[PDB]
Design a protein around this ligand. Structure first.
Ligand SMILES: O=C1OCC/C=C/CC/C=C/C(=N/OCC(=O)N2CCCCC2)Cc2c(Cl)c(O)cc(O)c21
Length: 207
């Protein structure tokens, strides 16, 4: 297991998301579904020029899996996934400009729900989660687990859990007072409100 420090501005964004008083937390689900949709668009796009990219799985979909016993909400997609370099470096690098644009916009009157307009909507997960684990598999690399409870650092390790073929699984370890996002009717409401036109099937698993 390797420990990395977030780029400073990203550590600052996560402190802001964690510490700002902001009741409209439900948007985190829209943002992560949107990220899954964008990851699915990428492998679909690349597959048109190279059909061998779907050898790791043709199905393009999103599953929502709540688990009251683990207090986890898991978003699973079969999109393009992330390499080790993606996890540690690339996405963080890309997110620098968006994080700065976002912080400035919040200075000028925007609110937290607008985060996804800046390409950094993943960090809205920390509105509801004390810890986030991401398992991912990209066609060009092995399976990895990334994890952070914020505080300025994250870790990455090889994952030898059940193999996933290709894609990303985001595991939201929910804060004690956010267990409403484990409820079936709450999840349906929010998907209906915010993610009505996503062009992949979203399956809400029940308990
Ligand atoms: O694999 C994913 O994107 C790969 C293709 C890129 C698509 C554009 C949408 C952005 C998505 C993401 N931005 O990450 C922000 C980030 O630095 N870190 C650290 C590494 C762990 C993931 C979060 C990662 C991602 C997220 Cl977050 C997701 O909820 C679903 C996903 O399928 C993917």
């Amino acid at each position: 297991v390797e420990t990395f420090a977030f780029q400073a501005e990203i550590a600052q964004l996560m402190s802001l998301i964690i510490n700002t008083f902001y009741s409209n937390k439900e948007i985190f689900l829209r943002e992560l579904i949107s990220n899954s949709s964008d990851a699915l668009d990428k492998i679909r796009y690349e597959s048109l020029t190279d059909p061998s990219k779907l050898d790791s799985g043709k199905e393009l979909h999103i599953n929502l899996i709540p688990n009251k016993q683990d207090r986890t909400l898991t978003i699973v997609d079969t999109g393009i996934g992330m390499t080790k370099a993606d996890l540690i470096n690339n996405l963080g690098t890309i997110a620098k400009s968006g994080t700065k644009a976002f912080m400035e916009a919040l200075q000028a009157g925007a609110d937290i729900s607008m985060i996804g307009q800046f390409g950094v909507g993943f960090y809205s997960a920390y509105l509801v989660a004390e810890k986030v684990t991401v398992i991912t598999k990209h066609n060009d690399d092995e399976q990895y687990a990334w994890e952070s409870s914020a505080g300025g650092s994250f870790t990455v390790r090889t994952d030898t859990g059940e193999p996933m073929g290709r894609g990303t699984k985001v595991i939201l370890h929910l804060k004690e007072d956010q267990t409403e996002y484990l409820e079936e009717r709450r999840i349906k409401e929010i998907v209906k409100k915010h993610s009505q036109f996503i062009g992949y099937p979203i399956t809400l698993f029940v308990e």
